[PDB]
Amino acid sequence: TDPPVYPVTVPILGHIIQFGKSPLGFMQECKRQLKSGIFTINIVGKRVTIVGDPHEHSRFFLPRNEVLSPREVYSFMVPVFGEGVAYAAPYPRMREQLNFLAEELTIAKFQNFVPAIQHEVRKFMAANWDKDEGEINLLEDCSTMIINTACQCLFGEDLRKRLDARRFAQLLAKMESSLIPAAVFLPILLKLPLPQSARCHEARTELQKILSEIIIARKEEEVTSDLLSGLLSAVYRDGTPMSLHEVCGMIVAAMFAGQHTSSITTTWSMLHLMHPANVKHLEALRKEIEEFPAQLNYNNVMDEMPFAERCARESIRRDPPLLMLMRKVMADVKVGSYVVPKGDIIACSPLLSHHDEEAFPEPRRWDPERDEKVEGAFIGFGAGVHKCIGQKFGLLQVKTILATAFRSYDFQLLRDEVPDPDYHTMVVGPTASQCRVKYIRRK
Ligand code: HEM
Ligand SMILES: OC(Cn1cncn1)(Cn1cncn1)c1ccc(F)cc1F
């Protein structure tokens, strides 16, 4: 009942190299070699048990923060979110804060959002996709459109007056680059190394101050909503409002979370769609869009593009951006047979589960018409107590980009096969240097 231990070739490496080079092969091999979807690698000195059996996802996603905890594992973010915020806060508090953010990303806010997205998409397309024909890096361009659209939805004109797409991206970048993700397995890393640290603190204070000012200026003004005003309106179980520290942290949580995943989802989708093999699916998308108007609206994209939602999801399915969900085991928990002992990190990998051949036949084929064959096997937005709260919003942007893009352009790869994924980044997407693409304007 203690899960099998993959043997540790070098006391140094643990497994950090092999895993980093091809995670699926590595984990599938671990499964066959060890005869069990549940097994333990020793990454660099800490045991990491992996729930690689999708019939058992609920063992990972359902227990409370008192058993299966995210605080430790997400400490390495304590400087982007800030010391108070999200998972660094006592459990009930964390949950309140997240709720307020989520209260701000539901279908109820999507009222003015589609126009605001669509406008940016056609604006980007009108400065940068000008010609009959042209080459672009699709991952950059999507990435840009995402950050643009998201601001348009979430900040006011006057928030945008001083902090735009550029400024903000510059700012997240000088924050993201503080991050030591390997510090999950050696928390000792958090302490010592401090070079890109003060560069992160000066960004967050810069942002936090722009904010302070905007609020101040926002209060002479009055003498309608957006993401920021929403969060300052929130009230905790007791008295307290949210402190500036906290609001700021949630605005970063949000912009940090959606920044790459949404881009990557859009880009993958478009990539598959433009591939000769996948003509049917692109016929399928093109039928879906036909009787759509030029200005879209809530109905067009929310209720009328199940096929586009299937494509977005199939992309995340094949090539999930967040490859590993993890938690710190506080109390011994059973997972199938096997007890996972306190102290272990426990993990659940969308990448491994999305290639269970029972759950997803022919897993490496991109097929938006497929459905999961084991229920809950798809964990691309996770599940249970920490299921993604931005999913409805992310796919609002992906779908609108799809719709908008495929209305007016075709696309050729400059490559025989769709790009391989690049497992070298925190958040995995197609290989940047394989995403140069040819766009054509229809007629
Ligand atoms: C394609 C877009 C996205 C993908 C593929 C994605 C993937 C995920 C996954 C796998 C989780 C669960 C994490 C865990 O179990 O530890 C998650 C959670 C979360 N996402 Fe996303 N995510 C996406 C978009 C977003 C966006 C745009 C936002 C912007 C708000 C957002 C905010 C959050 C938050 C706050 C959580 C954790 C909330 C909690 O612990 O209750 N997500 N996402
Ligand atoms: O899950 C993330 C944090 N993370 C895990 N690996 C890399 N970043 C990313 N994420 C979740 N949805 C989209 N991106 C997130 C970002 C913010 C947050 F509040 C919680 C949280 F898990």
Numbering used by the authors: 30 to 252, 258 to 477
From the paper:
As expected, fluconazole is bound in the active site by coordination to the heme iron via the aromatic nitrogen atom of a triazole ring and by multiple van der Waals and aromatic stacking interactions. However, we could not observe this phenomenon as CYP51Tb-fluconazole complex has been co-crystallized under a single set of conditions with one molecule in the asymmetric unit. The tunnel-forming residues are invariant between CYP51Tc and CYP51Tb with the exception of four conservative substitutions at positions 46, 105, 215 and 359. I105 in T. cruzi allows efficient conversion of C4-dimethylated 24-methylenedihydrolanosterol while the bulkier F105 in T. brucei favors C4-monomethylated norlanosterol.
Trypansoma cruzi, the protozoan agent of Chagas Disease, is closely related to two other major global pathogens, Leishmania spp., responsible for leishmaniasis, and Trypansoma brucei, the causative agent of African Sleeping Sickness. Both T. cruzi and Leishmania parasites have an essential requirement for ergosterol, and are thus vulnerable to inhibitors of sterol 14α-demethylase (CYP51), which catalyzes the conversion of lanosterol to ergosterol. Nevertheless, CYP51Tc and CYP51Tb do share 83% sequence identity, a fact which has been crucial for successfully determining their crystal structures and makes it possible to extrapolate structural features learned from one enzyme toward the other.
